[PDB]
Amino acid sequence: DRPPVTVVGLGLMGQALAAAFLKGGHPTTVWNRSPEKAERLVADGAVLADTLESAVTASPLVIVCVSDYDAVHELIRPVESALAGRVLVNLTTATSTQARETAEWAAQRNIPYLDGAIWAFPPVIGTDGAVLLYSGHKSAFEAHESTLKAIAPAATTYLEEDHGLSSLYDMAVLGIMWGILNGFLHGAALLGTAKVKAETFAPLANTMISAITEYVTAYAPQVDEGRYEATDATMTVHQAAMELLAEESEHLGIHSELPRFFKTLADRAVADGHAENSYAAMIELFRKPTA
Amino acid sequence: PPVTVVGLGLMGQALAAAFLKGGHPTTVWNRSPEKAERLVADGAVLADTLESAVTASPLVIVCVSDYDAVHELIRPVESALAGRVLVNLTTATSTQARETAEWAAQRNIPYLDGAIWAFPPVIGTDGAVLLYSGHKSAFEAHESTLKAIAPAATTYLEEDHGLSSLYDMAVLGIMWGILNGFLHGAALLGTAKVKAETFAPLANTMISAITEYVTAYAPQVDEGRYEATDATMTVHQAAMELLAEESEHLGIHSELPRFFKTLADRAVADGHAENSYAAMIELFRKPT
Ligand SMILES: NC(=O)c1ccc[n+]([C@@H]2O[C@H](COP(=O)([O-])OP(=O)(O)OC[C@H]3O[C@@H](n4cnc5c(N)ncnc54)[C@H](OP(=O)(O)O)[C@@H]3O)[C@@H](O)[C@H]2O)c1
């Protein structure tokens, strides 16, 4: 019942998890290269650890959330022994090919591994907001689902045994994720010029931001399918509009690099043919590599 | 009451219904006239020329390619327009809405800068949402009628036209920012023999999911310090590599993320490595 758990790496993200556990019964031991950065967790009742092995030792579940698989690897190895016998959940961010590669390493060292992908932000962690995708040893997944739920109680979730995907998806969403932050921060810079509090702006954004997810679902079909007979609008429209946006930004006296880029693609896609086609067609351009 | 609309673009046609399927009897016309049928079959009123079309309603709605087009229409019907009231929904900049605004008042033609946020289907539904800007007086008069098209959120700003349009711009960028990430993302899982059909749902999940946290930034921007909570630039920075690294590895267009990084790189270079992705804004204040 709320069993123990050990988490490694105390980034903004690192620390957020610990609480979910701590602030979910699960007694949590924690360890981090530089240390110091803890108090609140310890104050909130955590256990700082002598060394890594000590930290590992002290729990059946080992969560690792750090910079990069490079880091990960050069932790594990030193405790590789101690890990066998315990399940390793890697939430460090990494590519398909990285997840896949680290998956193998553990199995070859007889360590049950899970490659989890976080879709939540420090705050969100522990809430019905947060959502994770894990992939790996279904046995292990089933085995600790409970404790795992602590962080994404709404959607602690598992995909088949191939790790690649969990991570792959992770990438996909990222980028989408940035795609927004950008448009928004840009849009905001825009209304910035008009002495408009983002506080003001955002709401309506988010209003329209919710509005779009609609059309997206419709587009998927077009890609899944083929002909990009347009429903929304032609590329050529979108294309022009980007100019305007660019034109706007420039006029306003703020970075215009973003939209101008957006156009170049439109331009390409158009150049490539499908000017009449829905923005769907853009996909064909992404299927097409850039080096 | 009656209503008249101009332009049978993708957008043009969509609206008709909202009107038609909202009482408003609609006598419209089109640049490339020779289309309606289904509309006319669904029971429209097709006028002959522009003035004819203007004549035939107290409210007149124009949605065409671009303010360039718009402008070179007005004159011909400029007579018929006085008395009626036109709401420009042709896609156009602040400074274009501004110019259209001026010209109108200077000919006592009542104008509104209106911003459509919906997709053909969505039009007329509690989904659709419109942002207008113009004369308080005018708003009251057809608020109810106006609601017909965006029954959830037919909505009005200060008197400035610029803004309605401005906002419009702000979003579309956001809007593209998505379509891209998605289409790219989709190409990504493409490689893994993954139907977009499959992918999209979760996209849309995350598509809804983020707008939340974004708002948490607004204060930081409105404020100053970008003390990070979420994640430092430097994190995002690394992640973008991976994404880029991913795409490349997988054998698909990589130019996009490679860009993302450069900015990250800049922002970092420009100090705020520790700061939330918020800080990126400061790079937008810096012109191209
Ligand atoms: N922040 C978020 O919102 C968020 C969301 C989803 C996913 N993530 C993922 O979570 C991970 C970290 O995010 P974060 O913001 O918590 O990162 P962070 O603030 O940079 O923390 C990462 C941790 O990695 C440790 N570390 C890794 N390799 C090390 C090494 N070789 N030597 C010493 N310390 C090492 C760092 O310890 P020292 O620096 O003290 O040595 C630090 O505690 C990343 O993989 C990221 O993709 C973050």
Author numbering:
A (entry chain A): 7 to 297
B (entry chain B): 9 to 296
Text from the published report:
Imine reductases (IREDs) are one such enzyme class that have become widely adopted as biocatalysts for the preparation of chiral amines. These nicotinamide adenine dinucleotide phosphate‐dependent enzymes catalyze enantioselective reductions of prochiral imines to a diverse array of amine products, making them attractive targets for industrial biocatalysis. Of the enzymes tested, only one IRED sequence was identified with observable activity toward the conversion of 1 to 1a, namely, I127F L179V double mutant of IR361 (henceforth named HRED1.0) that was recently engineered by our lab for reductive amination processes involving cyclic secondary amines as substrates. Substitution of Met125 to either Phe or Trp gave substantial 6‐fold and 5‐fold increases in reaction conversion, respectively, under assay conditions used for evolution, with more modest ca. 1.5‐fold improvements observed with the H250L and A100T mutations. These beneficial mutations were subsequently combined by DNA shuffling, leading to the identification of a M125W H250L double mutant (HRED1.1) that displays a significant 20‐fold improvement in reaction conversion, and a 19‐fold improvement in reaction rate, over the parent HRED1.0 template.
The structure was determined to a resolution of 2.77 Å, with two molecules, A and B, in the asymmetric unit comprising one dimer. Two active sites are formed at the interfaces of the N‐terminal domain of one monomer and the C‐terminal bundle of the other through reciprocal domain sharing. However, the density within monomer A and the C‐terminal bundle of B was good, permitting the building of side chains and NADP+ molecule within the active site at the interface of the domains. Superimposition of the HRED1.1 structure with that of wild‐type IR361 revealed the consequences of the mutations. The substitution of I for F in position 127 at the bottom of the active site as presented in Figure 3a has, counterintuitively, made more space in the active site through the displacement of the side chain of (B)Y221. Mutation of M125 to W at the top of the active site has again created more space, despite being a larger residue as it projects upward and makes a new stabilizing interaction with the side chain of D176 through the N‐atom on the indole ring. Further stabilization of this conformation may be provided by a stacking interaction between the indole and the mutated 179 position from L to V, which lies on the interdomain helix on the other side of the active site cavity. (B)H250L is situated at the interface between the N‐terminal domain of one monomer and the C‐terminal bundle of its neighbor and may provide stabilizing hydrophobic interactions in a mode that has been observed for other IREDs in engineering studies.
